[PDB]
Design a binder for this molecule. Structure first.
Ligand SMILES: [K+]
Ligand SMILES: [K+]
Ligand SMILES: [K+]
Ligand SMILES: [K+]
Ligand SMILES: [K+]
Ligand SMILES: [K+]
Ligand SMILES: [K+]
Ligand SMILES: [Mg+2]
Ligand SMILES: [Mg+2]
Ligand SMILES: [Mg+2]
Ligand SMILES: [Mg+2]
Ligand SMILES: [Mg+2]
Ligand SMILES: [Mg+2]
Ligand SMILES: [Mg+2]
Ligand SMILES: [Mg+2]
Ligand SMILES: [Mg+2]
Ligand SMILES: [Mg+2]
Ligand SMILES: [Mg+2]
Ligand SMILES: [Mg+2]
Ligand SMILES: [Mg+2]
Ligand SMILES: [Mg+2]
Lengths: 35, 300, 59, 257, 101, 237, 92, 196
RNA sequence: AUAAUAGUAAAGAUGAAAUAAAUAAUUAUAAGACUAAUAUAUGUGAAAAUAUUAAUUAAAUAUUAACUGACAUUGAGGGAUUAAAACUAGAGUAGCGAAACGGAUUCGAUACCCGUGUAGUUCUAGUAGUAAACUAUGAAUACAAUUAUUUAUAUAUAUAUAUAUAAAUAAUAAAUGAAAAUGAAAGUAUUCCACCUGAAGAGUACGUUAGCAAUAAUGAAACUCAAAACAAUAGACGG
């Protein structure tokens, strides 16, 4: 999963995607797809 | 070339084996390939091995580990007795049946994913089937795999947001399901333990198909009667059945109602006498043993 | 049974060895020689087993 | 590998068959095809085992007492029996291929006709042939073999076998068909045979039998159907016994010189 | 007498194959000679890959490698590797100094 | 042991005896040995290829031949310590012969342990006569056994009918099961048919085993009794 | 893994005092049982009748019964015969 | 076994397999042909060929090889000194004179001719590792020798080595048979030239 | 060792002996020294040394990556460390134990054995720099035929073995050697240092330097002799 993981104890992938505009550019992408 | 010929030679055909020739544990199946020499070759100590077998050996069957050793001898035992166990099983004409009603392993059946619904049970069996693995080679299954699985992150970071985006925004109960399937789907192409060393079916003990009746001059045989021996004079402790020695196999004997009085009389010498038994069924366990169930037919 | 415990814990041997003082150099020499004899006996028994096995097979 | 033996005057046999018994097609079935069929199956059964280095006659004796080697015994017995039949019905045992010999008049010897009278209460050879034809029709319902055998007492007698029954070893003669009903006299013979086999002390449970065949007739469908047809096997046995090669049959009787 | 000592009779397990020799005295003697504690490895923590020095506060596990009087067993008896024997002995000596063993 | 000189120079030492006159008559072997000189080099010879798998011996992969990054993600820019050690010994050590078929053979007998109980004859007849067509498993001249499966698997992978060795192996295994089942039935039926026509057998396999077990169990009875009487007396002490 | 210990070259391979098993005399054990039978059930008790009869037969001709009263070990003969073959010594 | 390797045989080894060294049969064939030609030459020249083999079971092969080459054999024990101390060991035994057809001339031999050493012209040794004495005597006596050289055997001790398994009676009898027939052909070619 | 407790009449020692409310048992207290098994000094350390536990500080391994670019080897003089004994000063002193005084043994016994036991053995701060300080074998580099056994790293998989490459040890080929033997050196070569030139006199004398001292280092000659020494062989002899 990496950034898109459900684990309470996540890895640095999540923190990297945050600072790299990936967890945000994917949340908007998913929401835009839902639209 | 000489190398090509050697690979196909009869000595090459025997698979490498270093298992103890003197084993005192539990024996469930043959461990060494029986070697046989003809009478003419035996007269000349010729067995097709590297060196002549000592003339003291009068048997025509042996089992060996090494063609030669640092002690300048062949490591062999002049015995071939597992063949008589197989041939005695054939004479009892009891087909081996699955107690779980599984498909016949010797037929190419069209199977489906009925049992594949346990993808998370067996995909993790590769890392969890490590009962007897080294403390660090098993630990190499953690970093080596992590990198391989971590190389599919981009593929699963796009497929999951294109095939099941709702789960990524609602719950991971289904996401975990898509993960187990993803790896297996991307692993079926891979070759992890592509060769399975588990025993296939009977292991070669019997190739008889159930169903056939035994015609005899006295009519069709309905119950198979086989001479045997009772080993213990007291039922197996914690078990409601005694043990018998029938045709090179140890079976569990169930008595009609009572135990014959020769038991108490004979005592610990009960094995000195031969009784007649009926072989109810024969099953195969995963350890490679045969579970033979018998019945002490007593003159009545 | 009690005697077996004494001999498996070397109680009688230790008591006798503590009656008189031995110089460290002599102690080391005796420990080296005893180990050699123990290992030598193990090598001897291994060779006798090979002989018996070889005899049984007709060599 | 067991190979089909080469027969004398094989070119004639593949063109004109065996005169007065079988045609060219009939002989190709009984020998060139069936003997190939048997030898190949024997090779597949015995290759890789000690039996591969033994001739079929020795194989049947070695395996006669082993219940689970009956398949090998059957193949060895049939192969030996078939070449015993093809040998005494053959125009000439000597190879007159380059001598173009067309005069082979072989007649029963005096030792054979003397043992026939002694063993059959003065019956003539012609009468014994009728008994042989009768025995085949009433004792061999299906496949089998008809033999004229000699025992250790110098007496010639008639033995019939069902399927592949050896004449040499009485425990495997297969002369009684137990699929049908048997009389108390036949059961007595079987019971007495079982007792003899139980008196042997050998760990292989084998007995001594010195019976030897003198004449062999193949009663299998591979030998007569194509030329005679279902139901005409008695006409086939009559022709075989009337056109036997007596140079071979006479040599099978021990003289002692 | 209808009784025999257990040392004079062999009990053939269930599901195993046997030869006629398995009923002889030679089998009895042969089984005694080749009777080694080879099943210990699967039950021997110190032969599994764990570091014996992590058990210095668990006297119960350490007490499996000392005699009745507390004498550390020689490597010939424990069957451990040189490193594990070295580490195990250190663990036991440390355990003794802490007041647990 | 030192390389001997006097065994291969018998002709030259003999010629000195004849030229001087110490030996009057030429030996019968003298002319024969002169025409067929002995080999007298006794040298160690290098080898540059494993004959079994064709692996090249004595080849060093230079850093120029490894331009791409490794499994660790690093480029190789200099020779490593192993590359800088002379490897002359590998040229002279007899190569270890290996075969893919050996791996399948070990698998087959691990999957079918009882195939080991079928006796195998290691004595060869004539390797040069084997004319086998491995399009089919059965062959005239050899038994049906594990080797039949392995050779069939190799033919399938050699003809490229199957790509993966596992798939070819499984295909061969089923052909082996079919042939094994036809033979198990031919033997059972042959025994049944013979008994139905009056065939009699002295001792069966089951009976043979019972008799052998009795012989052993009788000696065991005596010893047990003897050793259960020495114990009783010795324990009385 | 079990440590193999290899000996240096030796002038001989010999057992100083080979252990030979010596079976017990059947008459002595018969006497040892009869003596015990008398210790429990009493001397001349009818319970020891069979013991007395057996002892008399065992000792009738020789008080220790006829026995194979000889046994020697051959380990040293074989050890000396096979040592050079099995010692694993390097070639000369 | 590779553990028993005598590294002086390195050039004869094809490889190792199943814990043993595999001898290169291409070299065995070339060495065998050369050795066979030597036996044929000596036989055709009328020389004395002795076949020495002291391993159990070799007698039958050794006796027939001697018979078909009109040679000699020793299967029981090589007496140390048979060649170097021949007068103390073999002087008492009887000699005979023969013609070019190998038929006894029947001429009585002077005591001078019956005490002279009768040295073999060629020595064939089946098991050289157990016959060092004979090989060294052959060297001292300038007698060419042929022997089967296994991977643990010293090649330089013999004039014409034949690399090959010396432990199997089949391998030994196969190599001995080839050498014996080569001798037979030499003998037949010598008897034929006398006729014509 | 001291005290208590009950309990007693011998205890202790030796080849046998004799010299100096106990001994034994159960408690309590004090003191000094030592470190059972594991254990192979395996390993570690330059050597000397180093094995009850923990902690702090310092040093030490393999592979890979990058970097420096011959910066190396050896090493006169010099420097540092260096067992046991010994000495200086101050503490300590259970046990052991030169000496001394006694008891025995013996023809005698300045001994071996026993008792009482001082210096010493322990710690702190120093002096001194000697041992069969030994592998009686200086250090470095290149190289040469095998096996076995461990260890380490790596590789593979049909997962627990298998395959590799080093190190250690054992037995060897070759080679070397007076041989015993050495065996990766006591082999094949190269480089640097130390040292030797018949025995005895002598590691002495004298001088010098250093030390609180004992001593340590350096280190001769005359006279006399045709000896003297090593390995191995066959004997003889051995409480
Ligand atoms: K050390
Ligand atoms: K530069
Ligand atoms: K410098
Ligand atoms: K200096
Ligand atoms: K003190
Ligand atoms: K030393
Ligand atoms: K130096
Ligand atoms: Mg050999
Ligand atoms: Mg006290
Ligand atoms: Mg300690
Ligand atoms: Mg060390
Ligand atoms: Mg320096
Ligand atoms: Mg002081
Ligand atoms: Mg004193
Ligand atoms: Mg100082
Ligand atoms: Mg001094
Ligand atoms: Mg000095
Ligand atoms: Mg020292
Ligand atoms: Mg340095
Ligand atoms: Mg001085
Ligand atoms: Mg000396």
């Amino acid at each position: 999963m990496g950034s898109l993981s459900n684990e309470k104890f996540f890895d640095i992938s999540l923190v990297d995607s945050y600072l790299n505009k990936d967890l945000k550019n994917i949340s908007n992408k998913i929401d835009s797809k839902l639209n | 070339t000489l190398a090509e010929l050697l690979g196909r030679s009869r000595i090459a055909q025997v698979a490498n084996n270093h298992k103890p020739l003197t084993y005192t544990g539990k024996k469930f199946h043959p461990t060494h390939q029986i070697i046989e020499t003809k009478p003419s070759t035996l007269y000349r100590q010729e067995w097709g091995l590297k060196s002549a077998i000592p003339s003291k050996i009068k048997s025509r069957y042996l089992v060996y580990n090494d063609l030669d050793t640092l002690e300048r001898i062949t490591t062999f035992e002049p015995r071939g007795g597992t063949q008589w166990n197989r041939l005695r099983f054939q004479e009892m004409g009891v087909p081996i049946v699955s107690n779980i009603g599984r498909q016949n392993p010797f037929f190419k059946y069209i199977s489906r994913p009925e049992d594949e619904s346990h993808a998370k049970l067996s995909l993790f069996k590769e890392m969890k089937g490590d009962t007897d693995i080294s403390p660090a080679a098993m630990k190499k299954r953690l970093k080596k795999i992590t990198a391989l699985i971590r190389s599919f992150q981009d593929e699963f970071k796009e497929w999951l947001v294109e095939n099941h985006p709702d789960e990524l925004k609602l719950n991971s109960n289904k996401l975990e399901d898509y993960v187990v399937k993803f790896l297996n789907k991307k692993l079926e192409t891979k070759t992890n333990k592509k060769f399975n060393t588990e025993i296939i079916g009977t292991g070669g003990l019997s190739y008889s198909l159930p169903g056939k009746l035994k015609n005899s001059p006295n009519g069709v045989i309905q119950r198979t009667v086989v001479p045997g021996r009772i080993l213990n004079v007291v039922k197996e402790n914690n078990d409601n059945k005694w043990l018998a020695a029938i045709g090179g196999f140890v079976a569990d004997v169930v008595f009609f109602q009572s135990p014959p009085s020769s038991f108490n009389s004979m005592g610990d010498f009960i094995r000195m006498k031969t009784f007649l038994f009926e072989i109810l069924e024969a099953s195969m366990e995963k350890n490679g043993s045969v579970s033979m169930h018998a019945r002490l037919l007593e003159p009545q | 049974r009690l005697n077996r415990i004494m001999f498996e814990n070397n109680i009688p041997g230790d008591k006798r060895s503590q009656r008189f003082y031995m110089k460290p150099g002599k102690v080391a020499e005796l420990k080296r020689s005893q180990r050699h004899r123990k290992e030598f006996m193990m090598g001897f028994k291994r060779l006798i087993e090979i002989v018996k096995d070889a005899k049984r097979k007709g060599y | 590998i067991h190979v089909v033996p080469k027969l004398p005057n094989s070119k004639a046999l593949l063109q004109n068959g065996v005169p007065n018994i079988l045609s060219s097609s009939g002989f190709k079935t009984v020998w060139f095809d069936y003997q190939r069929y048997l030898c190949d199956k024997l090779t597949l059964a015995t290759a890789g085992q000690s039996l591969e280095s033994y001739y079929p006659f020795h194989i049947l004796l070695k395996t006669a007492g082993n219940p689970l080697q009956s398949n090998i015994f059957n193949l060895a017995s049939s192969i030996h029996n078939n070449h015993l039949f093809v040998e005494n019905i053959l125009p000439s045992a000597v190879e007159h291929g380059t001598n173009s010999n067309a005069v082979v008049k072989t007649e029963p010897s005096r030792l054979f006709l003397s043992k026939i009278k002694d063993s059959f209460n003065g019956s003539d050879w012609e009468v014994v042939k009728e008994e042989m034809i009768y025995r085949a029709e009433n004792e061999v319902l299906g496949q089998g073999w008809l033999f004229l055998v000699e025992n250790n007492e110098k007496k010639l007698f008639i033995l019939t076998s069902n399927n592949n029954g050896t004449p040499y070893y009485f425990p495997r003669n297969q002369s009684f068909d137990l699929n049908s009903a048997i009389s108390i006299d036949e059961f007595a013979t079987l019971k007495q045979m079982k007792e003899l086999i139980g008196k042997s002390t050998k760990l292989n449970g084998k007995v001594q039998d010195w019976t030897m065949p003198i004449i062999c007739v193949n009663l299998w469908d591979h030998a007569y159907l194509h030329d005679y047809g279902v139901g005409n096997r008695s006409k086939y046995v009559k022709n075989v016994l009337d056109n036997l090669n007596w140079s071979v049959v006479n040599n099978r009787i021990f003289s002692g010189i | 007498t209808k009784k025999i000592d257990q040392s004079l009779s062999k009990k053939l397990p269930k599901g195993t194959i046997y030869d006629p020799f398995d009923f002889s005295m030679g089998r009895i003697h042969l089984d005694r000679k080749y009777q080694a504690n080879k099943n210990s490895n699967r039950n021997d923590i110190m032969k599994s890959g764990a570091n014996p020095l992590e058990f210095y506060a668990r006297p119960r596990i350490l007490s499996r490698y000392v005699t009745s009087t507390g004498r550390i067993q020689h490597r010939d008896i424990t069957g451990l590797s040189a490193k594990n024997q070295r580490r195990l002995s250190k663990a036991i000596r440390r355990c003794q100094a802490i007041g647990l063993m | 042991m030192k390389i001997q000189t006097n065994a291969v120079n018998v002709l030259q030492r003999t010629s000195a005896y004849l030229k001087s006159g110490l030996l009057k008559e030429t030996p019968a072997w003298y002319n024969v040995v002169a025409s067929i000189p002995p080999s007298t080099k006794f040298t160690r010879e290098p080898r540059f290829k494993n004959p079994s798998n064709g692996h090249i011996i004595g080849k060093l992969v230079d850093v120029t031949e490894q331009p791409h990054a490794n499994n660790k993600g690093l480029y190789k820019t200099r020779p490593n310590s192993s590359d800088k050690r002379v490897g002359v010994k590998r040229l002279y050590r007899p190569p270890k012969l290996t075969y893919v078929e050996d791996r399948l053979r070990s698998l087959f007998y691990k999957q079918h342990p009882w195939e080991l109980s079928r006796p195998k004859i290691l004595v060869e007849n004539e390797i040069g006569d084997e004319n086998y067509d491995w399009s089919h498993m059965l062959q005239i001249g050899r038994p049906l056994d594990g080797e039949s499966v392995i050779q069939r698997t190799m033919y399938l992978i050699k003809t490229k009918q199957y790509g993966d060795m596992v798939e070819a192996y499984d295909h061969a295994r089923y052909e082996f099961y079919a042939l094994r089942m036809q033979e198990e039935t031919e033997q059972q039926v042959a025994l049944e048919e013979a008994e139905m026509f009056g065939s009699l057998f002295g001792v069966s396999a089951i009976e043979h085993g019972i008799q052998k077990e009795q012989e052993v169990l009788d000696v065991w009875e005596k010893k047990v009794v003897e050793e259960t009487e020495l114990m009783a007396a010795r324990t009385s002490n | 893994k079990p440590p193999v210990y290899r000996l240096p070259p030796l002038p001989r391979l010999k057992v100083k005092k080979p252990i030979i098993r010596q079976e017990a005399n059947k008459c002595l054990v018969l006497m040892s049982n009869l003596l015990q039978c008398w210790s429990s059930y009493g001397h001349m008790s009818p319970k020891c009748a069979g013991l007395v009869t057996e002892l008399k037969s065992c000792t009738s001709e020789s008080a220790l019964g006829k026995r194979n009263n000889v046994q020697k070990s051959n380990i040293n003969y074989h050890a000396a015969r096979l040592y050079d073959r099995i010692n694993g010594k390097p070639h000369d | 076994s590779t553990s028993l390797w005598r590294s002086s045989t390195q050039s004869y080894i094809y490889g190792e397999y199943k814990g043993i060294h595999i001898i290169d049969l291409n070299q065995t064939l070339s060495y065998l042909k050369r050795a066979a030609k030597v036996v044929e030459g000596v036989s055709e020249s009328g020389g004395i060929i002795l076949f020495l083999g002291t391993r159990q079971g070799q007698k039958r092969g050794l006796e027939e090889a001697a018979k078909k080459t009109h040679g000699y054999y020793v299967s029981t024990r090589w007496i140390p000194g048979t060649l170097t101390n021949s007068t103390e060991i073999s002087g008492i035994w009887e000699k005979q004179e023969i013609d070019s057809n190998d038929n006894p001339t029947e001429r009585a031999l002077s005591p001078n001719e019956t005490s002279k050493q009768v040295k073999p012209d060629l020595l064939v040794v089946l098991n050289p590792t157990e016959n060092r004495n004979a090989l060294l005597e052959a060297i001292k006596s300038r007698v060419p020798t042929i022997a089967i050289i296994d991977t643990d055997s010293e090649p330089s001790l013999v004039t014409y080595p034949i690399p090959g398994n010396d432990d199997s009676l089949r391998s030994v009898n196969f190599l001995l048979g080839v050498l014996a027939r080569a001798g037979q052909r030499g003998l037949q070619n010598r008897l034929a030239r006398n006729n014509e």
